[PDB]
Amino acid sequence: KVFGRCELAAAMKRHGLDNYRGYSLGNWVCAAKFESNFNTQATNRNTDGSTDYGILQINSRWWCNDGRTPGSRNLCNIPCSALLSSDITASVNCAKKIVSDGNGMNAWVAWRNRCKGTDVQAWIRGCRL
Ligand code: NA
């Protein structure tokens, strides 16, 4: 599923991300835009053989099992395929674990390089929230 901006904002808000670990909703929307272009089915293969999955491009080295990332962890206790669903529950719940873990939203490269320090509230401006 390819979300619209306000549609995704609404889904993320209802699922508890607004101000989760102090990160306002616009941060999460911005991260999703630049990680996946709001596409739940996005995948990206990395150099190290891991893969990034879903609207927040969550990585198989640490967070999910894809059967093809040897020596890895599955800290969200999910198949990586759960991160591609039209239902963003698994992605949100896993994101909550990631952002609690130490470097906060810096875990998302697109967030650090394209959202951090910017007017992220623009990403939710106009939306009925
Ligand atoms: Na894994």
Side-chain angles (χ1 to χ4, degrees):
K1 162 172 178 179
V2 178
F3 277 81
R5 175 178 68 87
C6 294
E7 186 191 10
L8 183 61
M12 288 177 155
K13 191 168 177 175
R14 296 296 97 68
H15 284 266
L17 287 177
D18 187 22
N19 312 308
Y20 191 91
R21 283 252 58 170
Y23 292 90
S24 67
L25 187 61
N27 285 282
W28 295 103
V29 176
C30 184
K33 170 63 177 180
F34 295 129
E35 288 291 356
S36 68
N37 207 14
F38 300 149
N39 184 4
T40 69
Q41 299 194 76
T43 60
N44 169 252
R45 173 58 48 66
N46 300 119
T47 51
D48 70 354
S50 69
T51 301
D52 305 321
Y53 297 88
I55 205 162
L56 284 169
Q57 293 288 279
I58 288 170
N59 189 265
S60 64
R61 185 145 303 287
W62 299 107
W63 304 110
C64 62
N65 172 62
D66 63 6
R68 54 157 281 116
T69 312
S72 71
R73 301 282 273 290
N74 180 8
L75 289 171
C76 294
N77 199 35
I78 50 172
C80 297
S81 64
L83 300 170
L84 301 184
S85 177
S86 62
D87 173 353
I88 70 169
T89 298
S91 284
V92 169
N93 290 348
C94 188
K96 287 176 182 178
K97 187 179 306 291
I98 296 171
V99 75
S100 303
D101 94 309
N103 74 340
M105 287 196 77
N106 296 292
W108 289 274
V109 172
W111 179 86
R112 189 174 68 230
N113 287 332
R114 306 183 68 179
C115 302
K116 182 178 192 180
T118 76
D119 175 23
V120 294
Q121 184 274 338
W123 287 95
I124 69 168
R125 192 167 302 151
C127 304
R128 191 186 295 132
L129 296 169

